[PDB]
Design a protein around this ligand. Structure first.
Ligand SMILES: Cc1cn([C@H]2C[C@H](OP(=O)(O)O)[C@@H](COP(=O)(O)O)O2)c(=O)[nH]c1=O
Ligand SMILES: [Ca+2]
Length: 129
């Protein structure tokens, strides 16, 4: 896979962020993730985590997988990086997301993200507490 540039427009919630990509505003949905909704337990914490990570980044990148690039709602489907650190993985490692929505052909980083999840769950962090 390949990283491509984007710039932050606005934080949305744990697993969605508004970015400018190829000069156009898009909502991106994190591949292979499910954060709690804001109104659910750990939702505000997941939102705050993603918000801080993308707002503090000097360089945002998106990385599409091999399959679908946009979902049925018109959201981009990507792994998002903030100064080289994957947001999806960072959420997993802090117990603020679950690996989910694993569709065949669009699942390159599945096992990386599951490994982060296992280590969060061993530590009983956040969702796993
Ligand atoms: C992450 C992801 C979600 N989706 C769809 C499945 C879900 O459909 P439904 O809306 O019908 O449940 C929805 C979940 O997103 P949210 O977790 O943002 O609600 O987005 C994809 O189609 N592809 C994906 O890779
Ligand atoms: Ca969600």
């Amino acid at each position: 896979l390949h990283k491509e540039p984007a710039t932050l427009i606005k934080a949305i919630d744990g697993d969605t962020v508004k970015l400018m990509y190829k000069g156009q505003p898009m909502t991106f949905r994190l591949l292979l993730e499910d954060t709690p909704e804001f109104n659910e337990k750990y939702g505000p914490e997941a939102s705050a985590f993603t918000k801080k990570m993308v707002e503090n980044a000097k360089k945002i990148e998106v990385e599409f997988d091999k399959g679908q690039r946009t979902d049925k709602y018109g959201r981009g489907l990507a792994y998002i990086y903030a100064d080289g650190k994957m947001v999806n993985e960072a959420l997993e490692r802090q117990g603020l997301a679950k690996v989910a929505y694993v569709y065949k052909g669009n699942n390159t980083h599945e096992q990386l993200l599951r490994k982060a999840e296992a280590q969060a769950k061993k530590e009983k962090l956040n969702n796993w507490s």
